[PDB]
Write a protein that holds these residues in place. Sequence first.
Motif: not given
Length: 42
Positions: A8, A11-13, A15-18
């Motif tokens: 987390f 990927v805080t800014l 994003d893991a889905g990107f």
Amino acid sequence: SFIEDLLFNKVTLADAGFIKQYGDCLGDVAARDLICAQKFNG
């Protein structure tokens, strides 16, 4: 698990889905290989 927070915090800014689409898992960008290193947290 311990690892979920460290994932987390990367990927805080970003994003893991990107990153799922935009990281093919070459492993030169070792930082962004966290979706395949911990296999998308599952």
